[PDB]
Amino acid sequence: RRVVAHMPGDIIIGALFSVHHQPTVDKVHERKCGAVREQYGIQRVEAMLHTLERINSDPTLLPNITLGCEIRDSCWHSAVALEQSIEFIRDSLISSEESKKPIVGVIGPGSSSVAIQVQNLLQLFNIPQIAYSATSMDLSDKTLFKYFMRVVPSDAQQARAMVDIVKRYNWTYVSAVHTEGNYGESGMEAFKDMSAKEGICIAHSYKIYSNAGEQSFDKLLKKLTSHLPKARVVACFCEGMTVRGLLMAMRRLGLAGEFLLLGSDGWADRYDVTDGYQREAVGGITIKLQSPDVKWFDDYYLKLRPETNHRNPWFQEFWQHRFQCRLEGFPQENSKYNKTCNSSLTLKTHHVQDSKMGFVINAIYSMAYGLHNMQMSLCPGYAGLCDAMKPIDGRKLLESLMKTNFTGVSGDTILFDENGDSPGRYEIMNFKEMGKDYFDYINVGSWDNGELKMDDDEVWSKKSNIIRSVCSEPCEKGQIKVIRKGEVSCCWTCTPCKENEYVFDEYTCKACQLGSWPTDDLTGCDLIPVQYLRWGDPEPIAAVVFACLGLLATLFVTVVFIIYRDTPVVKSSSRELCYIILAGICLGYLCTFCLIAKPKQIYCYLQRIGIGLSPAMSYSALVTKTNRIARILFMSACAQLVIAFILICIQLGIIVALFIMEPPDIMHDYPSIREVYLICNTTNLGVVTPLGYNGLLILSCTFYAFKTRNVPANFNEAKYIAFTMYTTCIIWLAFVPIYFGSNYKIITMCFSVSLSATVALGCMFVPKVYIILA
Amino acid sequence: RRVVAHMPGDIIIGALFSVHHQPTVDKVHERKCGAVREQYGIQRVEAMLHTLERINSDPTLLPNITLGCEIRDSCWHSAVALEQSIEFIRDSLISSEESKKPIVGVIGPGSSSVAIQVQNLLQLFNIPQIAYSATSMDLSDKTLFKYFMRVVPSDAQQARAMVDIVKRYNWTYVSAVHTEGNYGESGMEAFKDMSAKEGICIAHSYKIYSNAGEQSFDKLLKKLTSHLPKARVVACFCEGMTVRGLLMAMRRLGLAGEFLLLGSDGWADRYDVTDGYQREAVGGITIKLQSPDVKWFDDYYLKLRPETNHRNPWFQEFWQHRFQCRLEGFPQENSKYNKTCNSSLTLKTHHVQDSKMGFVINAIYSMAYGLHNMQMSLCPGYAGLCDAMKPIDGRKLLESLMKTNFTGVSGDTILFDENGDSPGRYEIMNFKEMGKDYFDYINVGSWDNGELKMDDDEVWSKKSNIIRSVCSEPCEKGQIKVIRKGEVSCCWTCTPCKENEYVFDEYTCKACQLGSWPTDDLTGCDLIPVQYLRWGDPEPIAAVVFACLGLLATLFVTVVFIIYRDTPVVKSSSRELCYIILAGICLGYLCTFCLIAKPKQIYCYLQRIGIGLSPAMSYSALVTKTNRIARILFMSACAQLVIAFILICIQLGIIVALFIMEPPDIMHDYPSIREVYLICNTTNLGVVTPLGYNGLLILSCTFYAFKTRNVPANFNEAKYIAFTMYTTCIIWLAFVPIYFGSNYKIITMCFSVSLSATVALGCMFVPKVYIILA
Amino acid sequence: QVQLVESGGGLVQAGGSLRLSCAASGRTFTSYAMGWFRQAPGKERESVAAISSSGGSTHYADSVKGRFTISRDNSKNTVYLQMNSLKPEDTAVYYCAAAMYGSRWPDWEYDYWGQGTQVTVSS
Amino acid sequence: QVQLVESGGGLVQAGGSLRLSCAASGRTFTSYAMGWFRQAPGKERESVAAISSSGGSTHYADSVKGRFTISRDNSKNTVYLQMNSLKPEDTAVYYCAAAMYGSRWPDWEYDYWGQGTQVTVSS
Ligand SMILES: N[C@@H](Cn1oc(=O)[nH]c1=O)C(=O)O
Ligand SMILES: N[C@@H](Cn1oc(=O)[nH]c1=O)C(=O)O
């Protein structure tokens, strides 16, 4: 039967404090506890005892009513606390109603797994429970946990604070550890849920027991470092002892400074998890509940001596544990040590205040104010305890505590909502080395309603922080697309899309349509500039000058001929045939123009019509003359005019059908993706058919010329006609394959037409000019 | 403070029985109970008392150990039973370890919601609980409900039985009601989960409280009948009182026989839910746990008299309630009644045995055997109670009860697995009217490991059962597809796919491919038969007989010509030209054949070649003759042969190009979806080019014939030649449009060719044959 | 068990009136029929009256019928007997009893007793 | 509270040996230091010996140092004092006491007493 710390009074208040450590592994069945706790144990006991004494001494609180207490160990374990709560039920249930006085309520415990079970036991008998450290979020279900209250906020805000911290420093690939239990597990699920939305990954979650053996943490480090050196931050909802085990194993295996580790309030500002291993933990960032120090307890606590303490059963043992001695004549001598303590050892040596003492004292004050308010609002007739209040009712007490409104010892008004959750604030401490062999926790940031006010300059002391825990760097630099292996979306591989494709999706590019070139930054495409001839090239210049020379010669000859209509040469020859030849030459030389210019809707059609009509409009007169001279060896002028007009009409109809089959049009030729040209609609048949017609005409001309070659008549005109016909046939035969052998087709046609006209001009025009002149 | 029924002994066993009904609505806060229960109350109390007395009298069980009991009311309510269990704890614990003896275990309660919290309270103190009716499936979690045991199976088998029943009778559209609680709710979730797999729908679930007001059931009926008359079956996991309320409201609103209703074991064989309302419930089908009657309790119970009962506090009140009187001098006189009871009233009037008494007695026996086995296997040194057994340990008792193996009062061995669930069987009873004003529950089927052995003939007594509650009838009759409105998949609408579409998917059809007709039952596609006029059409017969007549004439004429090569008419004419004419006519008449037959790869090509070659090979000789006669007004035979061969070669080259452009082939024409024809592959150009060539030949023929019309030479041959040319031109002009005006082009072409050949034959062959003969 | 306490009796002149109060401890008094008995020196115990657990039914002895009244109040947990005319036979000690498993009157199987009260009647 | 019971004392010849057994009720005996005291008629109470709660440390008075032994056994919930060479000064009643919040010896703040045992030594 374990010991208890009691203080007599009219009313009795219970409490569960973990004076001893958790039972070690394989010893749970014996329910035997470990070492004594200095700051989570006895400090709380003395705080509660002194607080109740002080509130008893207060005249404005519970007049003529004295308040007692009953403190019991729980050893940070579920079963031990269940047994102690069963003892609490035994004290009030049977003997008190009809032992000691009934127990009004409990204050504790401080863990989110033990408190749940103690509440399950204590909600059947209607005994309110006010915790001070069980900051889990599964205890805010007032339908299932009805008699539970808190003086601290839940951990749905610690998860938000940790997410904001990890996001603010551009961490993306983080590990994950959490101690098994209702505190680590639910907080870690909340962290995962609120981290997935913010685009922050999780490398691999883990889970470990605090009391796990020495060889269960080496495995954890091996599985945590298998991901190195990609994830250099470990997010932890672990308790203090799990972090201590991690630090010990890191020192043993040799990972001093291997990776930063981010932690919760479990190891917020506790010197008892890094003492002796303060070299491995430098850099860690721990969130802490904001609680200022209390001077009442400091003044009262330091004067305590073991020989003058008649209220704490766990004091002398604590004294020999802290100072490492053996008191000679004390009842709990514990002679397993040596070097007995002097009469000069005091508690003000290496004193460290507990980090959650204000919450303890506020919980006690909250219970006292609930009792006082219900007393004055249920029994107004008397100042004290009345028969209407005997016995005290649990439901009335719960409904009186759910409306608390008062100022705590720290100076802040304490009021919690219908869910029983007082508001709170957070600090963000950083562990680092202030001096040589001197290490400490220093305040860096804060947290209140999302206003994370941190110090980027104070942490890492420079612009070069730890290597960011990232799997893929920002590789999509505007010319590379992103591909994933399918295993994880956190980090990816990079594939460069083709030069003809621009970036459209973050994951994939897309190629543009034909006729457009991707821009410099690959954000899109622009229309490829069109290349054409603007008379600047030397070959068009040469063609133009040759055409101009021929045109000047033709105009000179026709002016000379038209100056005098009557002449011996003019009388011998026919004016109609020479006029037709001149008109054909002029039409051809005009067709040389309007083709070298920029193509248009009608310019190229007119050029095609001219180049198809000029040889036809020219050869008709000469073939008629050859036919007449062959017949010699609708008559005369009428016959020649009829033949010429018939041939002209036939050629015009053929050309009309030619461009009826292929209407004129302009288009952008695409020789390659790089270059785009401008062309007119030119069907192959529409070009071929005039060539066939001209070939038939040339065959007739050469046959007739070879027929009448003997005649020296018309001032030896037969030789000139035969030579001209042979030259024209030869040049046409040589020029037919030229069109289908290069990309200079326009220049080839222009030159061929110009020289074909020039040959005939030189053959025929000059002799007439000589005959007129000399 | 409520009353208790106690029986002294060395060991104490508790029990929770619902002697009174549930507290009515709005009276829960007062925790006041209703009327006395006859079959769920006092019968079980007397069963427990007599069973413990009998097993105490047994020498082979617990020698020198006497077994007591403590029975408490629970009123079928949660809070009352929690208070009674707290009283059990108070009797145990403080007042017993240091009042009465500690309580070893409880037996009850019988509802799946009360038993849960009683187990929650009793698992902290390690008190085993053996229920007998709480057949829920959430109580088989040995991790959370550790101290709970049963003598009945769970309701994961009742759901399977109900699913099998509703599936066996082709029900598809069912309603759904269930009483709120941890018995109806989980059972209905299981029913839904195992009904979704079997393709059985749910119209609309509902939920109601047993103690709900009178006006809360009228709304339930209105919402249940809003679906009428589509769903005639209502699946219920309701308790007995919910079904009673439904029946009362059905009678009030007038729905006697409106729809059958299927129920669970909550109202399996209970006469206290249909008494006074047995006309509305005829037809219902209720599953029941299989429990034979017990004669021990029947023999013991009927001799009880109120003046000789000193163990049951709830007996006299029950007596005045049952017999409706007031005992004059009894302590609980209850003078609110009249017509005092005589001394002749007995319990064997209208006796109805409880349906779950074997389970109660088996639970008591199981607790006793657990105690005896642990006694004999933990303290073998003594026969009785020893100091090693004082006090009794809960954990050892649980681990001794988890291995029970014994035969129950019904004669069946009772052993339950590690989950604490004894096996069980089911019956399927039907409520119906045996006689006039006589109604009863009758056994119809059974259930054991899925072997549903029911009686289809016994239920509905004919082949016309209730109208199968199905939203959609089997409408997909092989020619209609199924379309859904999208709100619910239970029932659908029907759309008939087109006559060209055959059924492929249950929901949609698909159209047959071109050339395929949907089959008669629309299960597939079948190739459409091809139609071609092989031999039977009269027009081919007429064409064939005309061709045969022409061929016979041609053979006779050529035989006559070949008989004597030398003759005056033969000398005057040229043998070459007449031979060419005869060859052309023979080729044409052969081309008339091989075309009316079935098209092939070569036959149609040969016919197409011949129909073009014959006029070409024929007109050449006559046009040469006309040219010669025109020239008169390589010479002679050589010139004629040269001209004929040149024309033949030109025609052959034209035809060669013609079928080079369009290679021969055979195709299936598709004039319509209904009919498919067989044809040869041919192009309009391959018909036009020989047509144009023959037109030019005919133009030359008519020109030359009109030239030399005056000459009466060659025995007046000019008139015959001119008339033949005119007739051929006329028939050609008339037959050109025929080829593009009907689908009988083959017959028209054959007839035109045959008559064109016959005209020339009659023009030329007959006169020379006469000249030879007379 | 629950204790019974008696009050109101004493010595009074004959022909007077008195009230006798019987109070039971515990909280299960609403389910216990209450009987009034008498005992005089030199004679065997005799019955006086009875009241049912639920009330509304009174039983009076023939020798004292028509002049004595009895009532119960469960709220204050007591039973009152108003006694009139102070008959000479009333000089005896009066007992209060509780029975719950009784039979037809006057057979009630009493199991809880009380100290009673001595009432003396003058001449 | 727990009770203390004494046994083993009595009358014996001078110079003999004896064993005195002190037993405590309850189950919290393993956390209570135990003191042996003496009281003779005609004089004030005097200290004899003391044993720590955890054991392993014994305190003997100077006047009786070197001849008397003390031991504890928590399993049977008792403390034994072996008294060798019984001196004539042992003619007194011996008391057994329990203290837990004690100070440096012999100041231990005893709060639980016992009936003791009267031991008489012959001449
Ligand atoms: N809020 C924590 C309480 N806590 O756990 C530790 O390890 N230290 C500490 O204060 C929890 O709910 O578990
Ligand atoms: N097995 C049922 C028990 N039960 O409920 C009733 O209404 N009758 C009855 O026997 C349950 O678990 O709720």
JSON list of N, CA, C and O and ligand atoms in Angstrom, two decimals, chain A residues 40 76 110 112 133-135 183 239-240 265-266 270 356, ligand 1:
[
{"chain": "A", "resi": 40, "resn": "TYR", "atom": "N", "xyz": [9.07, 17.42, -11.71]},
{"chain": "A", "resi": 40, "resn": "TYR", "atom": "CA", "xyz": [7.72, 16.95, -11.96]},
{"chain": "A", "resi": 40, "resn": "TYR", "atom": "C", "xyz": [7.11, 16.26, -10.76]},
{"chain": "A", "resi": 40, "resn": "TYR", "atom": "O", "xyz": [5.97, 15.80, -10.83]},
{"chain": "A", "resi": 76, "resn": "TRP", "atom": "N", "xyz": [3.73, 8.18, -13.65]},
{"chain": "A", "resi": 76, "resn": "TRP", "atom": "CA", "xyz": [3.59, 8.40, -15.09]},
{"chain": "A", "resi": 76, "resn": "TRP", "atom": "C", "xyz": [3.06, 7.16, -15.80]},
{"chain": "A", "resi": 76, "resn": "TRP", "atom": "O", "xyz": [3.36, 6.92, -16.97]},
{"chain": "A", "resi": 110, "resn": "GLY", "atom": "N", "xyz": [-0.80, 14.69, -15.56]},
{"chain": "A", "resi": 110, "resn": "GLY", "atom": "CA", "xyz": [-0.21, 15.54, -16.58]},
{"chain": "A", "resi": 110, "resn": "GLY", "atom": "C", "xyz": [0.08, 14.89, -17.91]},
{"chain": "A", "resi": 110, "resn": "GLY", "atom": "O", "xyz": [0.77, 15.50, -18.74]},
{"chain": "A", "resi": 112, "resn": "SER", "atom": "N", "xyz": [-1.59, 12.77, -21.42]},
{"chain": "A", "resi": 112, "resn": "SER", "atom": "CA", "xyz": [-2.84, 12.68, -22.16]},
{"chain": "A", "resi": 112, "resn": "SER", "atom": "C", "xyz": [-3.38, 11.26, -22.29]},
{"chain": "A", "resi": 112, "resn": "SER", "atom": "O", "xyz": [-4.52, 11.10, -22.73]},
{"chain": "A", "resi": 133, "resn": "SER", "atom": "N", "xyz": [-1.49, 19.84, -17.83]},
{"chain": "A", "resi": 133, "resn": "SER", "atom": "CA", "xyz": [-0.53, 19.58, -18.89]},
{"chain": "A", "resi": 133, "resn": "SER", "atom": "C", "xyz": [-1.05, 18.67, -19.99]},
{"chain": "A", "resi": 133, "resn": "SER", "atom": "O", "xyz": [-0.40, 18.59, -21.04]},
{"chain": "A", "resi": 134, "resn": "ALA", "atom": "N", "xyz": [-2.18, 17.99, -19.81]},
{"chain": "A", "resi": 134, "resn": "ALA", "atom": "CA", "xyz": [-2.70, 17.07, -20.81]},
{"chain": "A", "resi": 134, "resn": "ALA", "atom": "C", "xyz": [-3.31, 17.88, -21.95]},
{"chain": "A", "resi": 134, "resn": "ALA", "atom": "O", "xyz": [-4.52, 18.10, -22.02]},
{"chain": "A", "resi": 135, "resn": "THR", "atom": "N", "xyz": [-2.45, 18.32, -22.86]},
{"chain": "A", "resi": 135, "resn": "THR", "atom": "CA", "xyz": [-2.83, 19.23, -23.93]},
{"chain": "A", "resi": 135, "resn": "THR", "atom": "C", "xyz": [-3.26, 18.52, -25.21]},
{"chain": "A", "resi": 135, "resn": "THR", "atom": "O", "xyz": [-3.19, 19.11, -26.30]},
{"chain": "A", "resi": 183, "resn": "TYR", "atom": "N", "xyz": [-0.93, 11.39, -26.90]},
{"chain": "A", "resi": 183, "resn": "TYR", "atom": "CA", "xyz": [-0.39, 12.74, -27.07]},
{"chain": "A", "resi": 183, "resn": "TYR", "atom": "C", "xyz": [0.41, 12.86, -28.36]},
{"chain": "A", "resi": 183, "resn": "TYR", "atom": "O", "xyz": [0.17, 13.77, -29.16]},
{"chain": "A", "resi": 239, "resn": "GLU", "atom": "N", "xyz": [8.10, 12.66, -26.22]},
{"chain": "A", "resi": 239, "resn": "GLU", "atom": "CA", "xyz": [8.26, 13.12, -24.85]},
{"chain": "A", "resi": 239, "resn": "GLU", "atom": "C", "xyz": [9.73, 13.39, -24.57]},
{"chain": "A", "resi": 239, "resn": "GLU", "atom": "O", "xyz": [10.61, 13.17, -25.41]},
{"chain": "A", "resi": 240, "resn": "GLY", "atom": "N", "xyz": [10.02, 13.89, -23.37]},
{"chain": "A", "resi": 240, "resn": "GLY", "atom": "CA", "xyz": [11.39, 14.23, -23.03]},
{"chain": "A", "resi": 240, "resn": "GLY", "atom": "C", "xyz": [12.31, 13.03, -23.02]},
{"chain": "A", "resi": 240, "resn": "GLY", "atom": "O", "xyz": [13.46, 13.12, -23.46]},
{"chain": "A", "resi": 265, "resn": "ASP", "atom": "N", "xyz": [6.48, 20.70, -27.00]},
{"chain": "A", "resi": 265, "resn": "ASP", "atom": "CA", "xyz": [6.60, 21.10, -25.61]},
{"chain": "A", "resi": 265, "resn": "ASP", "atom": "C", "xyz": [7.06, 19.97, -24.70]},
{"chain": "A", "resi": 265, "resn": "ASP", "atom": "O", "xyz": [7.33, 20.22, -23.52]},
{"chain": "A", "resi": 266, "resn": "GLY", "atom": "N", "xyz": [7.13, 18.74, -25.20]},
{"chain": "A", "resi": 266, "resn": "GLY", "atom": "CA", "xyz": [7.61, 17.64, -24.39]},
{"chain": "A", "resi": 266, "resn": "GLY", "atom": "C", "xyz": [9.04, 17.85, -23.91]},
{"chain": "A", "resi": 266, "resn": "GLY", "atom": "O", "xyz": [9.39, 17.44, -22.80]},
{"chain": "A", "resi": 270, "resn": "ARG", "atom": "N", "xyz": [13.53, 21.88, -20.91]},
{"chain": "A", "resi": 270, "resn": "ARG", "atom": "CA", "xyz": [13.89, 20.94, -19.86]},
{"chain": "A", "resi": 270, "resn": "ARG", "atom": "C", "xyz": [15.39, 20.66, -19.92]},
{"chain": "A", "resi": 270, "resn": "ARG", "atom": "O", "xyz": [15.89, 20.15, -20.93]},
{"chain": "A", "resi": 356, "resn": "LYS", "atom": "N", "xyz": [5.93, 24.55, -15.52]},
{"chain": "A", "resi": 356, "resn": "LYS", "atom": "CA", "xyz": [4.47, 24.53, -15.53]},
{"chain": "A", "resi": 356, "resn": "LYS", "atom": "C", "xyz": [3.92, 24.63, -14.12]},
{"chain": "A", "resi": 356, "resn": "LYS", "atom": "O", "xyz": [3.01, 23.90, -13.73]},
{"chain": "E", "resi": 1, "resn": "LIG", "atom": "N1", "xyz": [1.49, 17.97, -22.68]},
{"chain": "E", "resi": 1, "resn": "LIG", "atom": "C1", "xyz": [2.22, 16.73, -22.51]},
{"chain": "E", "resi": 1, "resn": "LIG", "atom": "C2", "xyz": [2.68, 16.63, -21.07]},
{"chain": "E", "resi": 1, "resn": "LIG", "atom": "N2", "xyz": [4.08, 16.27, -21.03]},
{"chain": "E", "resi": 1, "resn": "LIG", "atom": "O1", "xyz": [4.66, 15.08, -21.56]},
{"chain": "E", "resi": 1, "resn": "LIG", "atom": "C3", "xyz": [6.05, 15.12, -21.30]},
{"chain": "E", "resi": 1, "resn": "LIG", "atom": "O2", "xyz": [6.84, 14.30, -21.61]},
{"chain": "E", "resi": 1, "resn": "LIG", "atom": "N3", "xyz": [6.35, 16.34, -20.60]},
{"chain": "E", "resi": 1, "resn": "LIG", "atom": "C4", "xyz": [5.13, 17.05, -20.43]},
{"chain": "E", "resi": 1, "resn": "LIG", "atom": "O3", "xyz": [5.00, 18.09, -19.89]},
{"chain": "E", "resi": 1, "resn": "LIG", "atom": "C5", "xyz": [1.30, 15.56, -22.83]},
{"chain": "E", "resi": 1, "resn": "LIG", "atom": "O4", "xyz": [0.07, 15.74, -22.97]},
{"chain": "E", "resi": 1, "resn": "LIG", "atom": "O5", "xyz": [1.78, 14.40, -22.94]}
]
